Scaffold this motif. Structure first.
Motif, PDB file in Angstrom:
ATOM      1  N   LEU A 103       5.136  -9.459  13.846  1.00 28.47           N
ATOM      2  CA  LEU A 103       3.764  -9.561  13.355  1.00 28.47           C
ATOM      3  C   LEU A 103       3.093  -8.195  13.300  1.00 28.47           C
ATOM      4  O   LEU A 103       2.445  -7.849  12.306  1.00 28.47           O
ATOM      5  N   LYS A 104       3.235  -7.403  14.362  1.00 29.32           N
ATOM      6  CA  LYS A 104       2.596  -6.093  14.400  1.00 29.32           C
ATOM      7  C   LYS A 104       3.337  -5.046  13.575  1.00 29.32           C
ATOM      8  O   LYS A 104       2.728  -4.040  13.180  1.00 29.32           O
ATOM      9  N   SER A 105       4.622  -5.269  13.285  1.00 30.25           N
ATOM     10  CA  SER A 105       5.392  -4.289  12.530  1.00 30.25           C
ATOM     11  C   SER A 105       4.962  -4.231  11.074  1.00 30.25           C
ATOM     12  O   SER A 105       5.113  -3.187  10.437  1.00 30.25           O
ATOM     13  N   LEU A 106       4.407  -5.324  10.543  1.00 27.54           N
ATOM     14  CA  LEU A 106       3.856  -5.301   9.192  1.00 27.54           C
ATOM     15  C   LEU A 106       2.656  -4.368   9.108  1.00 27.54           C
ATOM     16  O   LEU A 106       2.566  -3.538   8.195  1.00 27.54           O
ATOM     17  N   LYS A 107       1.740  -4.475  10.080  1.00 29.17           N
ATOM     18  CA  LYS A 107       0.583  -3.587  10.141  1.00 29.17           C
ATOM     19  C   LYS A 107       1.002  -2.140  10.351  1.00 29.17           C
ATOM     20  O   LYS A 107       0.466  -1.233   9.702  1.00 29.17           O
ATOM     21  N   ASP A 108       1.981  -1.908  11.232  1.00 31.82           N
ATOM     22  CA  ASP A 108       2.408  -0.539  11.513  1.00 31.82           C
ATOM     23  C   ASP A 108       3.123   0.086  10.318  1.00 31.82           C
ATOM     24  O   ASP A 108       2.857   1.239   9.962  1.00 31.82           O
ATOM     25  N   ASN A 109       4.016  -0.665   9.668  1.00 32.23           N
ATOM     26  CA  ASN A 109       4.740  -0.134   8.521  1.00 32.23           C
ATOM     27  C   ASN A 109       3.872  -0.053   7.275  1.00 32.23           C
ATOM     28  O   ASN A 109       4.226   0.672   6.341  1.00 32.23           O
ATOM     29  N   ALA A 110       2.752  -0.776   7.232  1.00 26.15           N
ATOM     30  CA  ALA A 110       1.795  -0.536   6.161  1.00 26.15           C
ATOM     31  C   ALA A 110       0.968   0.713   6.437  1.00 26.15           C
ATOM     32  O   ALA A 110       0.748   1.527   5.531  1.00 26.15           O
ATOM     33  N   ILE A 150       7.224 -16.986  10.854  1.00 24.80           N
ATOM     34  CA  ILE A 150       6.687 -15.630  10.879  1.00 24.80           C
ATOM     35  C   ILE A 150       7.605 -14.671  10.126  1.00 24.80           C
ATOM     36  O   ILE A 150       7.133 -13.788   9.398  1.00 24.80           O
ATOM     37  N   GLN A 151       8.924 -14.860  10.246  1.00 19.41           N
ATOM     38  CA  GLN A 151       9.878 -14.081   9.459  1.00 19.41           C
ATOM     39  C   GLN A 151       9.725 -14.365   7.968  1.00 19.41           C
ATOM     40  O   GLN A 151       9.826 -13.451   7.140  1.00 19.41           O
ATOM     41  N   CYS A 152       9.429 -15.619   7.618  1.00 21.75           N
ATOM     42  CA  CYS A 152       9.184 -15.977   6.227  1.00 21.75           C
ATOM     43  C   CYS A 152       7.912 -15.329   5.687  1.00 21.75           C
ATOM     44  O   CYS A 152       7.899 -14.819   4.560  1.00 21.75           O
ATOM     45  N   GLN A 153       6.836 -15.328   6.479  1.00 27.04           N
ATOM     46  CA  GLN A 153       5.599 -14.685   6.039  1.00 27.04           C
ATOM     47  C   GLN A 153       5.745 -13.170   5.967  1.00 27.04           C
ATOM     48  O   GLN A 153       5.133 -12.527   5.102  1.00 27.04           O
ATOM     49  N   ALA A 154       6.561 -12.589   6.849  1.00 26.58           N
ATOM     50  CA  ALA A 154       6.850 -11.163   6.774  1.00 26.58           C
ATOM     51  C   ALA A 154       7.657 -10.832   5.527  1.00 26.58           C
ATOM     52  O   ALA A 154       7.423  -9.801   4.891  1.00 26.58           O
ATOM     53  N   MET A 155       8.593 -11.706   5.148  1.00 22.10           N
ATOM     54  CA  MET A 155       9.322 -11.511   3.898  1.00 22.10           C
ATOM     55  C   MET A 155       8.421 -11.713   2.686  1.00 22.10           C
ATOM     56  O   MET A 155       8.662 -11.115   1.631  1.00 22.10           O
ATOM     57  N   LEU A 156       7.393 -12.553   2.817  1.00 21.56           N
ATOM     58  CA  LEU A 156       6.420 -12.719   1.742  1.00 21.56           C
ATOM     59  C   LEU A 156       5.582 -11.460   1.554  1.00 21.56           C
ATOM     60  O   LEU A 156       5.374 -11.003   0.424  1.00 21.56           O
ATOM     61  N   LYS A 157       5.090 -10.887   2.651  1.00 25.45           N
ATOM     62  CA  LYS A 157       4.252  -9.697   2.554  1.00 25.45           C
ATOM     63  C   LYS A 157       5.051  -8.425   2.300  1.00 25.45           C
ATOM     64  O   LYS A 157       4.487  -7.441   1.798  1.00 25.45           O
TER      65      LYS A 157
END
Lengths: 210, 210, 53
Positions: free
Chosen positions: A35-42, B29-36
């Motif tokens: 969850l936090k890796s999306l924010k960090d990698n963005a 959560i892995q699915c939503q991360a793949m979506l984003k």
């Protein structure tokens, strides 16, 4: 063979319970890290793109970059559009931090609260008494069998106040009475002590009466 | 062997339920991360391509790049064509953010709501009473067996107001009555307490009557 | 600081109050940073987390 391996089997079952709790905690932590890796990698990609934009604005010597700095900065602003997006009024920034909604964070919090509520009832060091033939005659044995999961103990049997009637993990209960007896399995240790109650009811022979 | 291992087995089954919930949450959560990640990897690639376009426009010294800046920028605009695409009127940009439709985001939201609705009924710390021979005669035992999943308790049996009739997890219910009795399994603890009801109906002997 | 070193432009002195808040959003859930007039101050907000407990 069953009664000899029971302490190590209960220790292994408690270790497997610890494994099944720690695996769920590790999956929750891996999920929160994803969850936090999306924010960090963005955010680090937005920062790297802004560093490259100031790099091309540094060695520009053209003048078109001063007009495109209002254009490319809105392209870098769309990196974190679902996050704390940025803008440029006349050359200054302003972080929004819009507090964007997400149900899955709340479901993760509820599952963590569920796991912590489960963690309190996970006990260790519990003894257990057993007895076939809860009904008994005047002289029938009704073999009591106790089980203490302590490391080292004495595991005696006490008769209704403290009266020792056995030595360890087995009891042969003769009664010579009529009342309902209550036998206490006791496992003492250098650290702590445990007790457990069983109730063996005695009856007279219905054939011998009258 | 079955009754000794029951508390650890129920704790392991609750831990496996926690594991099966956390695995589904982690897959969501892995699915939503793949979506984003599609949006993020499109936007940072569009930004990197625009940085390289201003890099070739910086050290150009040719003049063809001023005419191709209306041509290559529409090629960079086709990176996020299914996303917030960009345009150039006479040297300025305008982010669209068209709010493009996707059913799978709504199905993900509905599955998250389903998981949160499932999360409330996942209980902990529930006791259970059992009794063979719900019908009983005047003096027949009808052995009651209780099960408390508490850490440490007293797990007594109470007779219709508070009257203690057993010690722990087993009861031998003599009646000497005719009415329908209601026996309460009780598991008290330093934190909370639980109760459970069973109904044992007594009849007289039909052969001895008249 | 590498792009501010070999800048020779002057726009970087005005953007150093702008890009530094972008670098400040890296650790926004952690010890974030700020710039008053060219100096920093570490917060270390002691952010809550149940999973550590």
């Amino acid at each position: 063979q069953v009664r000899a391996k029971m302490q190590i089997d209960f220790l292994g079952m408690q270790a497997n319970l610890q494994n099944a709790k720690a695996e769920t905690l590790n999956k929750l932590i891996q999920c929160q890290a994803m969850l936090k890796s999306l924010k960090d990698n963005a955010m680090i990609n937005r920062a790297n793109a802004l560093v490259s934009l100031l790099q091309v604005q540094a060695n520009a010597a053209n003048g078109i970059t001063t007009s495109n700095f209002e254009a490319a900065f809105k392209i870098i602003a769309q990196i974190g559009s679902e996050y704390n997006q940025i803008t440029l009024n006349n050359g200054n920034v302003s972080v929004q931090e819009k507090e964007q909604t997400n149900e899955l964070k709340t479901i993760l919090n509820s599952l963590s609260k569920e796991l912590e509520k489960l963690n309190q009832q996970s006990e260790v060091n519990s003894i257990q008494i057993f007895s076939d033939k809860l009904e008994v005659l005047k002289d029938a044995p009704a073999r009591l069998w106790g089980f203490s999961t302590l490391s080292n103990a004495k595991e005696g049997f006490y008769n209704e106040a403290n009266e020792q009637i056995a030595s360890g993990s087995v009891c042969l209960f003769r009664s010579d009475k009529v009342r309902k007896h209550t036998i206490t399995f006791k496992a003492i240790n250098t650290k702590t002590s445990l007790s457990k109650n069983i109730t063996i009811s005695v009856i007279a022979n219905k054939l011998k009466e009258r």
